Amino acid sequence: DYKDDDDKLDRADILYNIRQTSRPDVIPTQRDRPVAVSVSLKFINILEVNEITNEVDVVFWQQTTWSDRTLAWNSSHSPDQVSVPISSLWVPDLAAYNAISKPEVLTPQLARVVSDGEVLYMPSIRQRFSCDVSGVDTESGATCRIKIGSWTHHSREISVDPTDSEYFSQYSRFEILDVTQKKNSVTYSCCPEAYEDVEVSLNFRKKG
Amino acid sequence: DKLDRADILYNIRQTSRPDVIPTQRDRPVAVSVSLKFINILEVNEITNEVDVVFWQQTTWSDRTLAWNSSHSPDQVSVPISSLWVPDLAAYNAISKPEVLTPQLARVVSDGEVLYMPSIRQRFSCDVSGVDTESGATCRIKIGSWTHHSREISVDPTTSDDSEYFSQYSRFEILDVTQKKNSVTYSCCPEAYEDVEVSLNFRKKG
Amino acid sequence: DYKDDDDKLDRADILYNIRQTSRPDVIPTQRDRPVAVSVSLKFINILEVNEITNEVDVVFWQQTTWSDRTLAWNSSHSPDQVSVPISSLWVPDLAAYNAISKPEVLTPQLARVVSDGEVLYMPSIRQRFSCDVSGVDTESGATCRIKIGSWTHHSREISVDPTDDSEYFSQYSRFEILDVTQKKNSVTYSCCPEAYEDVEVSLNFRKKGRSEI
Amino acid sequence: DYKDDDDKLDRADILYNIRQTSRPDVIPTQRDRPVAVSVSLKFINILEVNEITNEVDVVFWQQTTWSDRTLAWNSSHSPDQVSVPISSLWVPDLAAYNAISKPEVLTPQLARVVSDGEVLYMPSIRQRFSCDVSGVDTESGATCRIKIGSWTHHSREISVDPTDDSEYFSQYSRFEILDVTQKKNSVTYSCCPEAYEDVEVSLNFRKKG
Amino acid sequence: YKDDDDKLDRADILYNIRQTSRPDVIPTQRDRPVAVSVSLKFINILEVNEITNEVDVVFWQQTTWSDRTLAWNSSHSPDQVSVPISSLWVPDLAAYNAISKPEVLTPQLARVVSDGEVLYMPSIRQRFSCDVSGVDTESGATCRIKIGSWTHHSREISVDPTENSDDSEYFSQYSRFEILDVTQKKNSVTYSCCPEAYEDVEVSLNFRKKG
Numbered sequence A: 001d002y003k004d005d006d007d008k009l010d011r012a013d014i015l016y017n018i019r020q021t022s023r024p025d026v027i028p029t030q031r032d033r034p035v036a037v038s039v040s041l042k043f044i045n046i047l048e049v050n051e052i053t054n055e056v057d058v059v060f061w062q063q064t065t066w067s068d069r070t071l072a073w074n075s076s077h078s079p080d081q082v083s084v085p086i087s088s089l090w091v092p093d094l095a096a097y098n099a100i101s102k103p104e105v106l107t108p109q110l111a112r113v114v115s116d117g118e119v120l121y122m123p124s125i126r127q128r129f130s131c132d133v134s135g136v137d138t139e140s141g142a143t144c145r146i147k148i149g150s151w152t153h154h155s156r157e158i159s160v161d162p163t164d165s166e167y168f169s170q171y172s173r174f175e176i177l178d179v180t181q182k183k184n185s186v187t188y189s190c191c192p193e194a195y196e197d198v199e200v201s202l203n204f205r206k207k208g
Numbered sequence B: 001d002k003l004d005r006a007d008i009l010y011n012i013r014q015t016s017r018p019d020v021i022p023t024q025r026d027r028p029v030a031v032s033v034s035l036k037f038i039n040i041l042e043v044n045e046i047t048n049e050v051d052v053v054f055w056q057q058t059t060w061s062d063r064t065l066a067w068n069s070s071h072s073p074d075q076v077s078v079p080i081s082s083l084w085v086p087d088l089a090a091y092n093a094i095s096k097p098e099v100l101t102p103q104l105a106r107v108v109s110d111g112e113v114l115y116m117p118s119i120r121q122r123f124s125c126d127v128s129g130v131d132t133e134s135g136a137t138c139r140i141k142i143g144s145w146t147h148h149s150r151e152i153s154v155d156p157t158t159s160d161d162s163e164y165f166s167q168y169s170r171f172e173i174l175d176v177t178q179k180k181n182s183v184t185y186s187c188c189p190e191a192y193e194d195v196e197v198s199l200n201f202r203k204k205g
Numbered sequence C: 001d002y003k004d005d006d007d008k009l010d011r012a013d014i015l016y017n018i019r020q021t022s023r024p025d026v027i028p029t030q031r032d033r034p035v036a037v038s039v040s041l042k043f044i045n046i047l048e049v050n051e052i053t054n055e056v057d058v059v060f061w062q063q064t065t066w067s068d069r070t071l072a073w074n075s076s077h078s079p080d081q082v083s084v085p086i087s088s089l090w091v092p093d094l095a096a097y098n099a100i101s102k103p104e105v106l107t108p109q110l111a112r113v114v115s116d117g118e119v120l121y122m123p124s125i126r127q128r129f130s131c132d133v134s135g136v137d138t139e140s141g142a143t144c145r146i147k148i149g150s151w152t153h154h155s156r157e158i159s160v161d162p163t164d165d166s167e168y169f170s171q172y173s174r175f176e177i178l179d180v181t182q183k184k185n186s187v188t189y190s191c192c193p194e195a196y197e198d199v200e201v202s203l204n205f206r207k208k209g210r211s212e213i
Numbered sequence D: 001d002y003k004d005d006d007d008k009l010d011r012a013d014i015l016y017n018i019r020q021t022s023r024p025d026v027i028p029t030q031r032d033r034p035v036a037v038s039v040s041l042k043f044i045n046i047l048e049v050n051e052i053t054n055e056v057d058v059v060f061w062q063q064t065t066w067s068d069r070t071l072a073w074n075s076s077h078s079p080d081q082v083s084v085p086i087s088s089l090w091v092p093d094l095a096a097y098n099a100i101s102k103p104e105v106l107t108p109q110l111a112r113v114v115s116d117g118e119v120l121y122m123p124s125i126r127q128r129f130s131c132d133v134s135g136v137d138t139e140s141g142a143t144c145r146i147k148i149g150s151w152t153h154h155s156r157e158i159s160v161d162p163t164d165d166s167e168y169f170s171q172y173s174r175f176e177i178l179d180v181t182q183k184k185n186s187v188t189y190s191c192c193p194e195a196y197e198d199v200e201v202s203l204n205f206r207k208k209g
Numbered sequence E: 001y002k003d004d005d006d007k008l009d010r011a012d013i014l015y016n017i018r019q020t021s022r023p024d025v026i027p028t029q030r031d032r033p034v035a036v037s038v039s040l041k042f043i044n045i046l047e048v049n050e051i052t053n054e055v056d057v058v059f060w061q062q063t064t065w066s067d068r069t070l071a072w073n074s075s076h077s078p079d080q081v082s083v084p085i086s087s088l089w090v091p092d093l094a095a096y097n098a099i100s101k102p103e104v105l106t107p108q109l110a111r112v113v114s115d116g117e118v119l120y121m122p123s124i125r126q127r128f129s130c131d132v133s134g135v136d137t138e139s140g141a142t143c144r145i146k147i148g149s150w151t152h153h154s155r156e157i158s159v160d161p162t163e164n165s166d167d168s169e170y171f172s173q174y175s176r177f178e179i180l181d182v183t184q185k186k187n188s189v190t191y192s193c194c195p196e197a198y199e200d201v202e203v204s205l206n207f208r209k210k211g
């Protein structure tokens, strides 16, 4: 409960509990079900766009959530949440398939763990992508698709699902017309199991 | 006295909880935040991006860290890896902060902790009017990333806006003002506090 | 067992087992033979091509597999596979001889270990290479050759065996792929008496949007 | 003594002793007198200068020495010195106030520790600075001043004191050095009551004809 | 020879090496300096600037030395193993006229031989301040790289040129440049800073742009 959120000893104790129970390297599967991972992108900026090379430089708030019930505690008279370094926690091994640079994480690498076992990690990230830039200077604009999925965990182990101008910079050379998100389950010739992904389509165009 | 310093550092490391907000008994950690500009380096009026260097003055209190200094040092420098530090982020930065200075804080015997790095960073802010007399006005917002208003409060602190500013920049500081906000986002039920730092500057004619 | 894949305690236990057994700095040689390392590149993208300096910037999916049977376990009623951080495992010390930048690994550094002892690591990597770019703007295209082999382990310790398509190749690349061929070599250099194996990957590619009459 | 410098077990024993005594995070203050740190810069190169932005990219040899007598040992029959990773040692928290990039350390991060307790750390560094570039094409040259001081230790705790000019300077630089002068400041800022010492290095340089 | 692929033997040799290795102590033997051999074979010349006298090169840095305390009996065990360099002492070498950090392109493993010889041979990309003048002339330019121990003087570490193979044996046929020749020489030099001499190896290569 909220009147206890600032009891420091309580938070320290919860962090200790979390660190004893957490298995940073094991998927927190429950009920012989895949871990349900939620993923949405809220765009913060569009910095560089190249219509010749089909490359973009974007900043986005990647909202990522899932649950590990082994981490839950009774919060009747203790903090409902604490911030935890992600190195103490399991995080889904998500990758953006068409990213062409490493993600540059702009924000402190702390997640929130909620007393019901929900884990929230929502970093702001700048990253470069290979996507369809054609039309960026037209009224229809461009539609750049970013596919994000678990790299090493197939659909039996991890499912992914969705969790834009509210946080989009008014100062960008560009403007968002629409962001849509859909989910796919796809199998490659490499592997017999399917890998789920969230595909985020960013329709945008140069201002004016 | 070195041994006295070694002992204070030991005490600090015994008591310090680097991953726990130091809020006690019941009040959100009061964090003081102030920017003193050092330099303005790259200004792109087309892409609306700036590249700046600022002294980020950050102070707060952890009274569990306090000690009686009647016959021992008043302060020691401590590596920030040994201390809790607020998880501040500049929302409109478009690059990671480049910390130019040694990552050491001062801990004072009354529990005050001061961290004040010099930081070069790239921002997305209004650069329109930089070449005019009124100047541009670049707004930088800084607040706690994962801690809302019940856990951390963020506040302004104040001399001359150009005291530490480089005479060799192509730019000059007309005015710096800092304002506090508390904003709830559609994502979450709690408010997060921030300092909006308004830097009014123009090219030197 | 496929049903038992999501038994969490089971996964945790296999991981513990693997870490007890794994020797991350020791080649997993079995029956007095070299570790057979399989290597295959699937190109994902060609980003920058400089016809003058003969350089390319490519993203490729480097599929590496090998066997360490000491890692095997009975999966009759347990997960068939688990993901393991590469820092917990031996990984072949592969190097691209003509690369001119460090490999930029774009994906999480986890391998899959299979209950029969097969270990799979398949990172996506962006890297720059010194290669023949000549002809990239013609029908026949350019052919850029990339060599990958073990850096410190010779043929008695590690063997590399290699195993179009544009299945994973971006349709948004300025370039398109005509053919990919992969040859195995065992070469002896004057520095050293023992040979080193490599796979030589021949990427035949050309610009889309070439001048056409 | 020098005749025992290469006794390996002796060196390993000295290293062990140093690591037992060393407090990497505690200033080695003696008799409560501020640790005296010498700082000298010998310029290696000037790589790129920008008259419009007043920025300079330089490479310099940053000669830093101080003492920690707790590290001393009797070298009558053992090595007079050994090299030690700086991570095992206290190093002064020096910062260059007008640097606009992180210092790029070109050399192995080892210090020398002498048996009298002297510690020497002299890295080669490439760094960008904001400084007066004007006059670079004249004969009077330009004068770019670099200030270096302890970041968190004021004058009661650390004092800095400046320790030919082109001896290590690259003959292949587009530029040449007319003069280097090194002076000591002790400055109080509005932020804080205590003074912070610095060494101000004035580099007078110009483009070659 | 027959015993190289005995994995338990290899693990035991690694254990032995790690037990006796002193990664931070020079492996001096019988009160004499560690003899470090260093040689560069060039892989590539990437970017050249005649105005600024800067050069971007890839080279194979062949570095060898001896640590006899690591030696073992290889009669019925492997003759060599690979070892992460973090487990071993490696000479603190620096390129004096390097103007950027060395970008190591290869895995950071050395070989240790049963007779105690250690071989580390990274492929490195690095940028240098050197004489670029004459690069597009038939005579070419001559860029000189000096490499020596940074903190160990001549009583502790000697550096020696190695050994010939063709100068272009590993050089990219696709570079815009071609190597005319490479020479190496040892120097031993005293600086105003220090009483002792520091040894270095000076690599001079005359290279030119293809025409």
Ligand SMILES: CC1CCN(c2cc(-c3ccc(C(F)(F)F)cc3)nc(N)n2)CC1
Binding pocket: A044, A061, A110, A111, A112, A120, A121, A122, A123, A124, A167, B091, B143, B144, B145, B146, B185, B188, B192
């Ligand atoms: C561009 C951003 C958009 C979101 N926004 C936020 C979000 C957050 C936030 C809240 C919760 C999390 C959680 F840890 F739960 F994942 C992360 C960030 N914090 C702050 N101070 N500002 C303002 C600037």
Ligand SMILES: CC1CCN(c2cc(-c3ccc(C(F)(F)F)cc3)nc(N)n2)CC1
Binding pocket: A097, A149, A150, A151, A152, A188, A191, A195, C044, C061, C110, C111, C112, C120, C121, C122, C123, C124, C168
């Ligand atoms: C570049 C494309 C992206 C989609 N696709 C894959 C491959 C894989 C993948 C990665 C690694 C393995 C491993 F090595 F661990 F077995 C298996 C599948 N995972 C996902 N989510 N997508 C094929 C390559």
Ligand SMILES: CC1CCN(c2cc(-c3ccc(C(F)(F)F)cc3)nc(N)n2)CC1
Binding pocket: C097, C149, C150, C151, C152, C189, C192, C196, C197, E043, E060, E109, E110, E111, E119, E120, E121, E122, E123, E170
């Ligand atoms: C540009 C390179 C130079 C030689 N060459 C080598 C050298 C080496 C090699 C041999 C021995 C070592 C040692 F560990 F001993 F130092 C390192 C690399 N390994 C491979 N696979 N290829 C291929 C092309």
Ligand SMILES: CC1CCN(c2cc(-c3ccc(C(F)(F)F)cc3)nc(N)n2)CC1
Binding pocket: D044, D061, D110, D111, D112, D120, D121, D122, D123, D124, D168, E096, E148, E149, E150, E151, E191, E194, E198, E199
């Ligand atoms: C650009 C440099 C200037 C001095 N010089 C040096 C200095 C040093 C040196 C001496 C002592 C230290 C010490 F550890 F004491 F600090 C550091 C470097 N070593 C070598 N090999 N060369 C040659 C070229």
Ligand SMILES: CC1CCN(c2cc(-c3ccc(C(F)(F)F)cc3)nc(N)n2)CC1
Binding pocket: B038, B055, B104, B105, B106, B114, B115, B116, B117, B118, B164, D097, D149, D150, D151, D152, D189, D192, D196, D197
């Ligand atoms: C950038 C300007 C010029 C240098 N100057 C300072 C500030 C500081 C300083 C003082 C106190 C702290 C503290 F630890 F308290 F946070 C940090 C830096 N130190 C030095 N040597 N010079 C004022 C800021």
Ligand SMILES: *[C@@H]1O[C@H](CO)[C@@H](O)[C@H](O)[C@H]1NC(C)=O
Binding pocket: B068, B069, B070
């Ligand atoms: C601190 O210690 C000193 C001497 O030990 C004593 O004067 C003092 O009362 C203590 N602190 C206070 C004033 O509370």
Ligand SMILES: *[C@@H]1O[C@H](CO)[C@@H](O)[C@H](O)[C@H]1NC(C)=O
Binding pocket: C074, C075, C076, C077
């Ligand atoms: C592996 O162990 C299981 C135990 O359930 C048992 O079936 C058998 O001993 C092994 N598997 C096979 C081949 O039956």
Ligand SMILES: *[C@@H]1O[C@H](CO)[C@@H](O)[C@H](O)[C@H]1NC(C)=O
Binding pocket: D074, D075, D076, D077
């Ligand atoms: C140092 O050691 C020498 C050699 O035994 C000895 O003669 C001398 O007394 C020692 N010096 C001191 C004061 O420790």
Ligand SMILES: *[C@@H]1O[C@H](CO)[C@@H](O)[C@H](O)[C@H]1NC(C)=O
Binding pocket: E073, E074, E075
């Ligand atoms: C090493 O091998 C034999 C083992 O039969 C051992 O007894 C002896 O010490 C060594 N002999 C040599 C030098 O090969």
